[PDB]
Write a protein that binds this ligand. Structure first.
Ligand SMILES: *[C@@H]1O[C@H](CO)[C@@H](O)[C@H](O)[C@H]1NC(C)=O
Lengths: 456, 456
């Protein structure tokens, strides 16, 4: 009885997008998810629909084979993503006596693991756009998993190389608790122990922990000075902020210099106010420019034209805070009544990772093209060898795929299913105006550390 | 589409039994299974129905909580067992908005792995009765898996202890190639290197290898005499037999003293004709007395009073090679009509592991009782804490369970989910008629070797 986004075709690409936030702590059992999401949700849904459209128009790629998809809501939770993934498979097992060819998603690593653990049973390839856990690289455990996104070892790598470039010997190690935290640090600690660096103080904390928890963290960090000067935070955007708040109450400022992972990146949202305590820090952003195209598509979207996305109505009302002349999903919660002509441009922000989400889809497309070229030579449409499509076949076939990234970037996969790492080094500093801004100071292109030393 | 055995209750225990043989080599894709099975199938089906009945009758075990089950056909194949297992979960996810509480089965280890890999993703405990492979003990990989029978490893300890009891210094090491062979031997070879024993000659061979392969094995074994006097075979049934055939052509006779694993056990099948080449060997059987009760129940089964087993009709006709006039399940292959009241005794042989299959069920029962005693205090029936039942909770619960085996035997589980050792020491010798009979000469109850020395 949960909603599903469908668009028909010859080969159906199935995706898992966090359309709604995850179910509240106590409702997980009955699997009723929370409020709707635009960035990690409605956009990506529309992104897939859109992308898939551009492709059915490209006369070069997948000529007379239409790509269709079935998009399900992951609610950013294993509990549900699995609930849905089952259905991918249930349905598939049936149209064998339309089936899924592969799956784009899910967004979280800790979840993509669950999806992969289930999806791999049934020879369904899985391409991910933001799952950076480094456990996924173990192809003995996650054989049918790949990503259009780099692995996090590559990030502990770039962070270490940053620590290397500046002749540093002792660095504190703080990271967010969980998978994102452990994975990366586990790779830094080790990648570090090799290159020589001696890890000074080492701690771990939950992003949603009390001020008490952080204060205890800040103390410990300070006590290990002056060696524990450089703190390396493989931390979630808020683990950092939390650490800054601990610096506010303790009134210390300028004691620590930081190096943070894409959890922090160049988000204003993290150093809000705390511009000072969190100044001069260096962070890793993810290399990915906003898609020219998508913006033009996701904005001229109307409440009465969009026929394929059953969530729009819900979304739309939540996005403008208003309720309709009755409907089926009339969201009562509101006092105002939608005109239906509101503009999606007020406070519009394209999904950050939005670039990746598309690459992923393409890989799934390209993968199919190649499978076709080899298994149906000369043939224009789909031949008996791809009716139905073979899992393990499409898999190694996706692995051996290369295409022009959504932004003139090159895209391919190594033997483990990972992607090449292109990072951006960010530094927080005082410019000319009254602004504390994130200044781009360097790049990391697979092993190549480029820092404009004079810009820091 | 595929039939399912269903008995309603308050907590539904799900089971996977090989009702049919596995689908022929080339039909696996469409998943159509072969001929019906009585021992590994109809009996166990009936065994579960039966057992569950005695438990709904026991005044003490689950007083006002009826145990029900849903029994599905595994066809002794991953392809299908998974197909069905999905349904356990499909259904289960649904009643959350009747669900499975746990699963008895499957039969094979290589399969139980697939079932466990899927069943674990949804917090469904899994109790197995004949899956003995060692890998399942890794709880980091098969967290929700346990059994009421020991691992293969245990065996080694008992085989070695047998070697220890007789003051032997040099033994030959032969075993089957594959999962079984390597596992056990790997544990012997090591358990042996500790206790002191010096491994003389050491070899490994495939059960389905040519007479050439074995002859080469036999030679090598002999050459290492008189030290390589005691050969320790951690071998499948036929690996042994094959070795006997090698002794026939080379015309040699009992130069060796064999010690074989449950692959050989007390199977007449293995020493067919070669009663002489192999007479005297010592083997390890798995203690499993026949169930008094079951026999009485399975035999008085009428084709018209037994409605809960949908397979009976099919089975019945295949068991007596006759058809049933105008039936919804009338078989055409046969020539003469079924009297309907043929006797199920002609050549009746109770399932060998039939004892285990029941223990398993009980554990699932007992497990539930305890979760009830702990979580529904004051309530006689099921309380909101068990509506629905919690996976991870029932599981570690099951673990901490202990009950009187179906045959006085004690039953519990260690922290990995494995069961206690209960090997029976069989020796082949000449008794009273022209029968070479396996004679029971000793037991191994977790570390305790007991051999009636005078009986050998
Ligand atoms: C529970 O079952 C027993 C007999 O099996 C009966 O005496 C008792 O009344 C039952 N309890 C309830 C609440 O019905």
């Amino acid at each position: 009885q949960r909603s599903v986004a469908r668009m028909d075709g010859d080969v159906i690409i199935g995706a898992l997008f966090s359309v709604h936030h995850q179910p509240p702590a106590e409702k997980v059992p009955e699997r009723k998810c929370g409020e709707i999401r635009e960035q990690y949700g409605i956009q990506r849904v529309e992104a897939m629909f859109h992308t898939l459209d551009k492709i059915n128009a490209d006369p070069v790629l997948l000529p007379n084979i239409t790509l269709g998809s079935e998009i399900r809501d992951s609610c950013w939770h294993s509990s549900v993503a699995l609930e849905q993934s089952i259905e991918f498979i249930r349905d598939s097992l049936i149209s064998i006596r339309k089936p899924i060819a592969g799956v784009i998603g899910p967004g979280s690593s800790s979840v993509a693991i669950q999806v992969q653990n289930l999806l791999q049973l049934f020879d369904i390839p899985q391409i991910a756009y933001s799952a950076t856990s480094i456990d996924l690289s173990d192809k003995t455990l996650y054989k049918y998993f790949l990503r259009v996104v780099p692995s996090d070892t590559l990030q502990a790598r770039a962070m270490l190389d940053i620590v290397k470039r500046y002749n540093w010997t002792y660095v504190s190690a703080v990271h967010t608790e969980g998978n994102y935290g452990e994975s990366g640090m586990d790779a830094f600690k080790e990648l570090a122990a090799q290159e020589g660096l001696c890890i000074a103080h080492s701690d771990k904390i939950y992003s949603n922990a009390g001020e008490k928890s952080f204060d205890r963290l800040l103390r410990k960090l300070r006590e290990r000075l002056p060696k524990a000067r450089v703190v390396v935070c493989f931390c979630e955007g808020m683990t950092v902020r939390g650490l800054l708040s601990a610096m506010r109450r303790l009134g210390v400022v300028g004691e620590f210099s930081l190096i943070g992972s894409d959890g922090w990146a160049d988000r204003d949202e993290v150093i809000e106010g705390y511009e000072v305590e969190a100044n001069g820090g260096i962070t890793i952003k993810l290399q990915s420019p906003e898609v020219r195209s998508f913006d033009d598509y996701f904005l001229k979207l109307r409440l009465d034209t969009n026929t394929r996305n059953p969530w729009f109505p819900e979304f739309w009302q939540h996005r403008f805070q208003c309720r309709l002349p009755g409907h089926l999903l009339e969201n009562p919660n509101f006092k105002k009544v939608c005109t239906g002509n509101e503009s999606l441009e007020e406070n519009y922000v394209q999904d950050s990772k939005m670039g990746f989400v598309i690459n992923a889809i393409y890989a799934m497309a390209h993968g199919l093209q190649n499978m076709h070229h080899a298994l149906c030579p000369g043939h224009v449409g789909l031949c008996d060898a791809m009716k139905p499509i073979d899992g393990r076949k499409l898999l190694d076939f996706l692995i051996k795929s290369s295409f022009v990234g959504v932004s003139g970037e090159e895209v391919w996969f190594d033997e483990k299913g990972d992607a090449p790492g292109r990072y951006d080094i960010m530094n927080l500093q005082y410019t000319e105006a009254n602004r504390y801004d994130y200044v781009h100071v360097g790049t990391w292109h697979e092993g190549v550390l480029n820092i404009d030393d004079y810009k820091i």
